Amino acid sequence: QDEVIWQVVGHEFCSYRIKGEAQNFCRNEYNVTGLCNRQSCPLANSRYATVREDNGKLYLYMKTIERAHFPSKLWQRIKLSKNYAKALEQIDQQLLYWPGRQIHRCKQRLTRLTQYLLK
Amino acid sequence: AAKYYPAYRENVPKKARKAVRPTKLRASLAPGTVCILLAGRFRGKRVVVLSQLEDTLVVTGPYKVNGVPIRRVNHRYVIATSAPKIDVSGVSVEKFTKAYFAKQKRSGPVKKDEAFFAENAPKNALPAERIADQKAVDAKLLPAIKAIPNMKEYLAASFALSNGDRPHLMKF
Amino acid sequence: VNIIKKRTKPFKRHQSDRFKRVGESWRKPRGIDSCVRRRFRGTISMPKIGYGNNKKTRYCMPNGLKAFLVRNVSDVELLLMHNKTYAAEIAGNVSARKRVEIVEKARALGVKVTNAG
Amino acid sequence: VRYSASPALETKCAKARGAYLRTHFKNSREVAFTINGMSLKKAFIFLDNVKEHKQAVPFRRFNGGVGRTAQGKEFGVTQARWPVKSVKFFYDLLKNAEANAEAKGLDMDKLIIKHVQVNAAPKQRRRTYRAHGRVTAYLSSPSHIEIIVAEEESRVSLKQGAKARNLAARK
Amino acid sequence: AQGHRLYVKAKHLSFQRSKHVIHPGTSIVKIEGCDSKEEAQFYLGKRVCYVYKSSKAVRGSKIRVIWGTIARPHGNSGAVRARFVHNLPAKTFGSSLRVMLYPSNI
RNA sequence: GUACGUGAAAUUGCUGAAAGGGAAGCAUUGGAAAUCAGUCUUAC
RNA sequence: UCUAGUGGGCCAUUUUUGGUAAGCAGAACUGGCGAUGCGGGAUGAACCGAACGUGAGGUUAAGGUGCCGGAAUGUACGCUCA
RNA sequence: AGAAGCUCAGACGAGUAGGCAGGCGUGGAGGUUUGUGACGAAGCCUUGGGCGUGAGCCUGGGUCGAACAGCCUCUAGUG
């Protein structure tokens, strides 16, 4: 079923997919890499995590297989407002067991957002 | 660990197998040889080789003869001559190293000024120890070229090519 | 890997210099007697797949980045994780207000702007 | 309507325009090229001389079949004519430009023809009847003329720096 | 004034070419006194340059130089092939070049 | 400015530059002259 | 399995017929040109060599090295005076 | 690891008539993009820059004044 979703949305129309002439960018509000791919596909992965920026505050999102039918409680929010290091250990801790290799990607994403926040 | 990691997994270069081995200089560039400088500000000067450094030759035509201080000169920019050898066994050559001739580190794009050019110069910059070393090597080198005739003024002169001279036929 | 261009001059259409009705845009000569089609020595060359550039350095600017067209701030944030691969290029129809907003967005991201000035 | 040239700044210049003037564009161009650059007063003297056949307008571009004359030698040419219709139009415009300079407060002694250009005006067209029941064009080539009168008209390397210092300053 | 000229005088003869096709990347150079390929072997790898004069002052210099290296002998009459950092202009056919004595091995 | 939105090309005049001993255009390579971007400056 | 174009050819090697002969007409075998650039034969559709993605270096083919023109006004032995 | 992706190796590359494949461009339709726009859309001019083997595409400056575009599909009086 998760593969059905990817075969429907990945290669064709998707509101978070931005195809230009040779490449795919994924702006989806719950992705980390920024690119379109099942491994990183937020909608087609039932267990997946992300970080995004908001008003000087970092946010980590997670979602599971249990709450798929209820979009309202489907995604889970946590807020971060501390320095980078501690913000790193939070993602490390929150993901040392959950995604598999998203730990490094969201460390990279948290990196870029904190440079945004200082600027 | 670190702060603000790059968003790109760094590409470490493959382990190179290029081992540095000592340079085998030309068999005719023995210490004490009279050589001809081909490039640089002292092109055409005749100099006396002191020692062979890692890549170049630590060389000076006696500063009281032709005014060429102690310099490194790359071995590809000298024509070694067949002139009689000068005794350079009695002069210390261990203190002439890459560190000795090394320039001051800059690591920045800012440079150049009229006062900068007014700086350096022989009057400034030039250490008293460097002057003393030049005088000491002069004291140890002049007696040999005084003893063998015509070599003092030979070192003073400047090499030049004339009409009809063909360097492949000519030997030095 | 530095960028190498197999060819720098454009492939201009044959006889576009002599006739104004014939444009510079490359057209393949279909003529039965065409000197350029038959590849006579001294005639203009034709586009060939051998002229294609290295896949690693293709579409790359001399600085190594790829100019990705940008029309609003959300277009800039798409380059958040690819600021050493792409360079923002503000579209020509974007007004001055969003042009300033995109520039400050891109400078915050650390994304280079090809036409910032 | 704006003029062709960067001058016509009204602080130190004058200009005058003529449009749809029914005279030959080729003759007007030759007159304009001849008078371009001479002083306004001497331009008037030349134009009266052309009207009186004392001087001739050299024909340089549109010279096909134009006869030879001795009055072209001061321009180093053999073909020259005396187009009086074109010269009359140019005289009227130059008088208008001089009047504009007068009202603007310029100096008549120092004025020169800084810019003069002739452009082709739309053709009015007429009919001429040929042999074998054929009709063709009897076109007229008018000219737009515009005139503007006005007044008057390293880093050095380290080795290079050291060489320069030790040679110049030391001696 | 004969206390200088640490170079050997040479002349740019032509590009390397067939009967009808030229190859401007490499040039043919006649070094004076070089009359055989055995003599050309001495001049192999030497640093050859084209020195010319311009009105514009680049870095305060009226003299600008294009450098190059002798690559191989050409023919039997002592002519050599030379590769320059910028291909020599075709207007220099018959002009003079300076062949230094470095990189020296003598 | 009614010869009126925008105003292309052919073609034309002016200006600046350049070229030219019975065509011109083109391709290739570099020179000259004009013009211009990248890169850099930093980050660690 | 379905379908395109084609159903005017031409030249050379060798064999051969008609012909006074022909840059003529007709065939056989093969190779080519047509559909093919490149090196060479000054020049040329089929001759010689070689068949072609974009380039760098090296080396050759056919053919050349007095000058035009890249490359010995080379070597050896004669012949030739027009 | 847009598995329609990534990676390794080898051979190879002429072409009219003609066949096939993948792409570029145009008008209109459905969906989509918190899409661009009178703080200048479309169009036009350009000895500016950039990308692509190419069809082309983007951009700086100038002019201009009311609309237009990216992507997925549909379509045709489409070069």
Rounded to whole angstroms, the Cα distance separating E73 from E90 reads 21
Rounded to whole angstroms, the Cα distance separating C108 from C86 reads 15
Interface mutation target, options E32, E34, E42, E101, chain B, most CBs of B under 10 Å: E101
A87: three-class secondary structure by DSSP? helix
Domain-wise residue ranges, chain C? 1-117
User: How many Å is the Cα radius of gyration of chain E?
Assistant: 14
Looking only at the bridges linking them, the beta strands covering B78-80 and B34-37 are antiparallel
Return left, alpha or beta for B65; rule: phi > 0 is left, psi -120 to 50 is alpha, else beta: alpha
Q: Provide the resolution (angstroms).
A: 2.8
Q: Do A108 and B4 touch (CB under 8 A)?
A: no
Tokens of residue D103, six digits: 């009202």
From C74, C81, C110, residue closest to A34, measured CB to CB: C81
Looking only at the bridges linking them, the beta strands covering D127-129 and D135-137 are antiparallel
Q: Does C84 contact B at CB distance below 8 Å?
A: yes
Looking only at the bridges linking them, the beta strands covering D143-151 and D13-21 are antiparallel
Pick the closest to residue E7 from B45, B160, B42, B36 (CA basis): B160
Nearest residue on chain B to A33, alpha-carbon basis? B7
Contacts of B111 in chain D (CB under 8 A): 158
| E64 strand F contact, CB < 7 Å | yes
CB-side exposure of D50: number of CA atoms within 13 Å?
27
Interface mutation target, options B43, B117, B126, chain D, most CBs of D under 10 Å: B117
Nucleotides of F under 7 A from a protein CB: 3, 9-15, 24-34, 37-42, 44
Q: How was this structure determined?
A: cryo-EM
Q: Does D164 contact E at CB distance below 8 Å?
A: no
Residue owning tokens 């904190």: A114
Pick the closest to residue B93 from B59, B135, B55, B116 (CA basis): B59
In this complex, the nucleotide whose C1' atom is nearest to the CA atom of residue C52 is H53
How many D×E Cβ pairs under 8 Å? 9
Pick the closest to residue D31 from D151, D153, D149, D147 (CA basis): D147
Are the C-beta atoms of residues D28 and D152 closer than 8 Å to each other?
Answer: no
In this complex, the nucleotide whose C1' atom is nearest to the CA atom of residue C3 is F38
Contacts of B76 in chain E (CB under 8 A): 102-105
Rounded to whole angstroms, the Cα distance separating A110 from A50 reads 9
Rounded to whole angstroms, the Cα distance separating D63 from C61 reads 55
From E5, E102, E104, residue closest to B161, measured CB to CB: E5
Can you state the percent helix, strand and coil of chain B, rounding each to 5?
Answer: 20, 15, 65
- Cα first-last separation, chain A: 42
Instruction: Please give the tally of structural domains in chain E.
Output: 1
Domains of chain A in start order, with CATH, are 2-116 (3.30.390.110)
CB-side exposure of E106: number of CA atoms within 13 Å?
18
Q: Does D157 contact E at CB distance below 8 Å?
A: yes
Contacts of C85 in chain B (CB under 8 A): 8
The CA angle E81-E87-E90, to the nearest 5 degrees, is: 90
Angle, nearest 10°, between helix axes D84-104 and D25-35?
50
* Burial (CB count <10 Å: 0-12, 13-18, 19+), residue D15: buried
Rounded to whole angstroms, the Cα distance separating B62 from B48 reads 7
| C38 CA to G16 C1' distance (Å) | 39
For chain D residues 71-110, those near strand F by a CB cutoff of 7 A are none
| D114 CA to H1 C1' distance (Å) | 75
| C93 CA to H9 C1' distance (Å) | 49
The CA angle D37-D43-D46, to the nearest 5 degrees, is: 125
Rounded to whole angstroms, the Cα distance separating E79 from E93 reads 14
In this complex, the nucleotide whose C1' atom is nearest to the CA atom of residue E23 is F29
Nearest residue on chain E to B28, alpha-carbon basis? E106
Q: Does C103 contact A at CB distance below 8 Å?
A: no
SS3 letters across chain D:
CCCCCCCCCCCCEEEEEEEEECCCHHHHHHHHHHHCCCEHHHHHHHHHHHHCCCCCEECCCCCCCCCECHHHHHHCCCEEECCHHHHHHHHHHHHHHHHHHHHHCCCCCCEEEEEEEEEECCCCCCEEECHHHCEEECCCCCEEEEEEEEECCCCCCHHHHHHHHHHHHCC
Contacts of B8 in chain C (CB under 8 A): 84-85
Which residue numbers come right before each break in chain E (C to N over 2.5 Å)?
A: none
| Residue whose CA is minimally distant from H23 C1' | A21
B59: three-class secondary structure by DSSP? strand
Are the C-beta atoms of residues B115 and B66 closer than 8 Å to each other?
Answer: no
In this complex, the nucleotide whose C1' atom is nearest to the CA atom of residue C48 is H53
Q: Is the peptide bond before E103 cis (omega within 30 degrees of 0)?
A: yes
| C38 strand G contact, CB < 7 Å | yes
In this complex, the nucleotide whose C1' atom is nearest to the CA atom of residue C39 is G37
Amino acid at D166: N
Q: At CB < 8 A and 24+ separation, what contacts does C66-72 make?
A: C67/C114, C68/A20, C69/A20, C70/C102, C70/C106, C72/C98, C72/C102
Q: Do B4 and A114 touch (CB under 8 A)?
A: yes
Domain of E30? Answer: 1-106
Q: Do chains B and E touch (3 or more CB pairs under 8 A)?
A: yes
Longest dimension (CA), chain C: 60
Are the C-beta atoms of residues D7 and D134 closer than 8 Å to each other?
Answer: no
Neighbour subunits, D (≥3 Cβ pairs < 8 A) = B, E
Rounded to whole angstroms, the Cα distance separating A39 from A51 reads 16
Looking only at the bridges linking them, the beta strands covering A75-80 and B71-74 are unpaired
Looking only at the bridges linking them, the beta strands covering A48-54 and A57-63 are antiparallel
Q: At CB < 8 A and 24+ separation, what contacts does B17-23 make?
A: B22/B54, B23/B54, B23/B55
Contacts of B77 in chain E (CB under 8 A): 102-104
Rounded to whole angstroms, the Cα distance separating D17 from D144 reads 8
Nearest residue on chain A to B6, alpha-carbon basis? A108
